[PDB]
């Protein structure tokens, strides 16, 4: 038992102790909704067999148009990380971030200042794109992909005529080797798991929190309570839930840590920088 009490205050006290040196963040769609990117969990014209087919690789490869139509509708006017992203930046700068495992493809962790080595982009990224042909794999940048999306021309390889897709992991695709490589090391020794903006419904990402040592405390910051968390039973000993929006949860935790001013300054200067671009 490493937490004195199963509360946000208990987690904050623990984070301040010398015991808490290494923190893994596990994040999903809920950390980016306030950045104007909706939770993926006008397409009627395509008569999809079921709504989920939009993100399945087998369906996508033969009928890519519905996906790219959705991409146009939901493409943000700007890429601006949230308070929650900047909380993770604070963890990084304070030497507390072992890794951020993300389910998101929006690049906002990168923009917030998390480096390549800080991240496991478990579901890939929208930032880069590639031809699907293994013998070709021609790369295309975001500007090229965005132009195809907005002009409603299906991305096609200029060399081999094959489909070009963003470097996202569609349902039914393998996760990157980096995911499994980092998982095998990071969860052997970690002091805290910070689970934010995910209901842990997607595998094998959902399985990650079970990989931590049994003594590792785990804080959930999410709108609602499949990872194997136990908050409420008489056997509860290490898991804490804070229910609401991720920005507000991170602000509450930062205030308890005495980081409220530091966080708000960081958000405001970084937002100013992005707006001045």
């Amino acid at each position: 038992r490493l937490l004195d009490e199963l509360t946000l205050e208990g987690v904050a006290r623990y984070m301040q102790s010398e015991r808490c040196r290494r923190v893994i963040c596990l994040v999903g769609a809920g950390i980016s909704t306030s950045a104007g990117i909706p939770d993926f969990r006008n397409l009627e014209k395509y008569h999809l067999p079921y709504p989920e087919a939009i993100f399945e690789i087998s369906y996508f490869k033969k009928h890519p148009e519905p996906f790219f139509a959705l991409a146009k509708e939901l493409y943000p006017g700007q890429f601006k990380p949230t308070i929650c992203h900047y909380f993770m930046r604070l963890l990084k700068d304070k030497g507390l971030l072992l890794r951020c495992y993300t389910q998101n493809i929006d690049t906002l962790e990168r923009i917030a200042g998390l480096e390549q080595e800080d991240l496991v982009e478990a579901h890939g990224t929208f930032y880069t794109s590639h031809c699907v042909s293994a013998s070709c794999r021609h790369e295309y940048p975001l500007s090229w992909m965005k132009e195809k999306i907005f002009s409603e021309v299906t991305p096609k390889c200029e060399d081999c005529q094959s489909l070009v897709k963003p470097d996202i992991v569609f349902f039914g695709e393998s996760l990157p080797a980096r995911f499994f490589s980092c998982m095998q090391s990071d969860f052997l020794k970690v002091d805290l798991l910070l689970v934010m903006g995910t209901s842990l419904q997607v595998q094998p990402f959902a399985s990650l929190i079970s990989k931590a040592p049994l003594s590792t405390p785990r804080l959930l910051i999410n709108k609602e309570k499949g990872g194997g968390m136990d908050f409420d039973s008489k056997k509860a000993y290490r898991d804490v839930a804070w229910l609401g929006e991720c920005d507000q949860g991170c602000l509450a935790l930062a205030e308890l840590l005495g980081w409220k001013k530091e966080l708000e300054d960081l958000v405001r200067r970084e937002h100013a920088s992005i707006d001045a671009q």
């Binding site: 569609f170 349902f171 039914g172 996760l175 997607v202 094998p204 499949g226």
Partner: peptide, 7 residues
């Protein structure tokens, strides 16, 4: 390598 499932 293991695949993305559960959507």
């Amino acid at each position: 390598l293991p695949k993305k499932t559960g959507g």
